[PDB]
């Protein structure tokens, strides 16, 4: 009580410093209180650059998360050098999180508080929710018993969706199999090798047979779907003292991938030699809950969680030599905390189209759209 | 100095 009183003052405190310290930082900071706060965002592939325009325009997705009242599925425009809802989209119960296919980004995979994960082509339904309230996606994907967070689309085979569970398992669907009844499609593949809530998975970027799920099991497993048997992984990784919550594979380095975990760390692993963690990343003070390598840059990852402050690192500064009053503030790795947000981070995007631009979502409403200065990076 | 804004950055803005 008291001493929820003390972090609450020491959190405000610090925003305000972030805030006058804005412009040695950032090159961008755009602040928006969404109407319900976000557990998803994810930057869509495509820009629009308007006619003699100062500005392009960028596109998000995002979810609700109401206490008694209608979810939506959202779509938001970002003009980047004004944040509009653009489509919404009736969604039953808030979403957990939201991703689109790479080979067709009109298609959305959806997380649900249930065991159903839903698709929705978002170009197939009206701009403005339906008022009947009544969520109608395009198929019904069905196999979990409960519902989950994890959520990965197959970049080189087209519709194959991964989902972890708090079932333990992980769910594959082709979605492009004929539907039953209601538009279901009932899961192609059940992977069974966790013992605990499942809380992220990934598909390897190159390989497409590949995949990686971490758990609150505390292990990361590597599996190959041309295996026949879907109850043992091809490795088993001990990779934290905790919870693992994500996982993300790196898109210009094949063997390298991170997790992050409720442990505080980020690990960095090498496919060739699971045996050992390549690296730990450690700064954090609560537990992680998101990943996310830089799409431009392949020494550059992010990560985020309850400790409210995202974290941006570049390996390529690992082991270099630092004064001991800059070790006080973190490893040399260290590059960037984003001060921005003042309750936990519950998802972020790197925008694919201009370096350096993240979007994150917190639990109280917030979106950031920000980018770092250059006078970070370079040099 | 690009220093002091490292400094800065990693101990995010304050």
């Given at each position: 009580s008291f001493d929820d009183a003390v972090e609450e003052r020491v959190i405000n405190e610090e925003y305000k410093i972030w805030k006058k310290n804005t412009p040695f930082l950032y090159d961008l900071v755009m602040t928006h209180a969404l109407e319900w706060p976000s557990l998803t965002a994810q930057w869509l592939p495509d820009v629009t650059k308007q006619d003699g325009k100062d500005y392009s325009v960028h596109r998000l997705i995002l979810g609700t998360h109401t206490s008694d009242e209608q979810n939506h599925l959202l779509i938001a425009s970002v003009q980047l050098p004004k944040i509009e809802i653009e489509i919404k989209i009736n969604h039953e119960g808030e979403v957990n999180r939201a991703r689109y296919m790479p080979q067709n980004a009109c298609v959305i995979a959806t997380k649900t508080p249930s065991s159903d994960v839903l698709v929705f082509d978002y170009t197939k339904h009206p701009s403005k929710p339906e008022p009947s309230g009544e969520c109608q996606p395009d198929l019904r994907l069905r196999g979990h018993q409960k519902e989950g967070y994890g959520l990965s689309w197959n970049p080189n085979l087209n519709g194959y969706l991964l989902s972890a569970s708090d079932d333990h398992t992980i769910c594959l669907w082709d979605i492009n199999a004929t539907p039953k009844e209601h538009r279901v499609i009932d899961a192609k593949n059940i992977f069974t090798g966790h013992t605990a809530v499942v809380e992220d998975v990934a598909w390897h970027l190159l390989h497409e047979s590949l995949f990686g799920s971490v758990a609150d099991d505390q292990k990361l497993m590597i599996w190959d779907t041309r295996n026949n048997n879907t109850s043992k992984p091809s490795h088993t990784v001990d990779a934290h003292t905790a919870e693992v919550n994500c996982l993300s594979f790196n898109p210009y380095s094949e063997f390298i991938l991170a997790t992050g975990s409720a442990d505080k760390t980020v690990a960095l692993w090498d496919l060739r030699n699971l045996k050992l963690k390549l690296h730990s990343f450690e700064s954090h003070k609560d537990e992680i809950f998101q990943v996310q390598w830089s799409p431009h840059n392949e020494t550059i990852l992010a990560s985020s969680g309850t400790d409210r402050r995202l974290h941006v690192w570049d390996?390529?500064?690992?082991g270099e030599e630092q004064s001991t009053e800059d070790a006080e503030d973190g490893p040399p790795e260290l590059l960037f905390i984003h001060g921005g947000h003042t309750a936990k981070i519950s998802d972020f995007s790197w925008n694919p189209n201009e370096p350096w631009i993240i979007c994150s979502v917190s639990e109280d409403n917030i979106m950031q759209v920000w980018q770092m200065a250059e006078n970070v990076y370079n040099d | 100095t690009k220093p002091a804004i490292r400094r800065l950055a990693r101990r995010g803005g304050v």
């Amino acid at each position: 009580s008291f001493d929820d009183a003390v972090e609450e003052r020491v959190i405000n405190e610090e925003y305000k410093i972030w805030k006058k310290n804005t412009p040695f930082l950032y090159d961008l900071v755009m602040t928006h209180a969404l109407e319900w706060p976000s557990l998803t965002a994810q930057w869509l592939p495509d820009v629009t650059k308007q006619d003699g325009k100062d500005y392009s325009v960028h596109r998000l997705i995002l979810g609700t998360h109401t206490s008694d009242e209608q979810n939506h599925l959202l779509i938001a425009s970002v003009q980047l050098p004004k944040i509009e809802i653009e489509i919404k989209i009736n969604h039953e119960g808030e979403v957990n999180r939201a991703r689109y296919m790479p080979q067709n980004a009109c298609v959305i995979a959806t997380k649900t508080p249930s065991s159903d994960v839903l698709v929705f082509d978002y170009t197939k339904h009206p701009s403005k929710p339906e008022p009947s309230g009544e969520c109608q996606p395009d198929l019904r994907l069905r196999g979990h018993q409960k519902e989950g967070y994890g959520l990965s689309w197959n970049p080189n085979l087209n519709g194959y969706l991964l989902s972890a569970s708090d079932d333990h398992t992980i769910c594959l669907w082709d979605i492009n199999a004929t539907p039953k009844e209601h538009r279901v499609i009932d899961a192609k593949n059940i992977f069974t090798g966790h013992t605990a809530v499942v809380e992220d998975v990934a598909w390897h970027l190159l390989h497409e047979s590949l995949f990686g799920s971490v758990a609150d099991d505390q292990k990361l497993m590597i599996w190959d779907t041309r295996n026949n048997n879907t109850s043992k992984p091809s490795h088993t990784v001990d990779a934290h003292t905790a919870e693992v919550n994500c996982l993300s594979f790196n898109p210009y380095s094949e063997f390298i991938l991170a997790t992050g975990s409720a442990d505080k760390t980020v690990a960095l692993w090498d496919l060739r030699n699971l045996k050992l963690k390549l690296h730990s990343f450690e700064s954090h003070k609560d537990e992680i809950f998101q990943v996310q390598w830089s799409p431009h840059n392949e020494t550059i990852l992010a990560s985020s969680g309850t400790d409210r402050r995202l974290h941006v690192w570049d390996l390529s500064k690992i082991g270099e030599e630092q004064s001991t009053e800059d070790a006080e503030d973190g490893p040399p790795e260290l590059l960037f905390i984003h001060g921005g947000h003042t309750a936990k981070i519950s998802d972020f995007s790197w925008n694919p189209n201009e370096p350096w631009i993240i979007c994150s979502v917190s639990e109280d409403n917030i979106m950031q759209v920000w980018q770092m200065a250059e006078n970070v990076y370079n040099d | 100095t690009k220093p002091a804004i490292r400094r800065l950055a990693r101990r995010g803005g304050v």
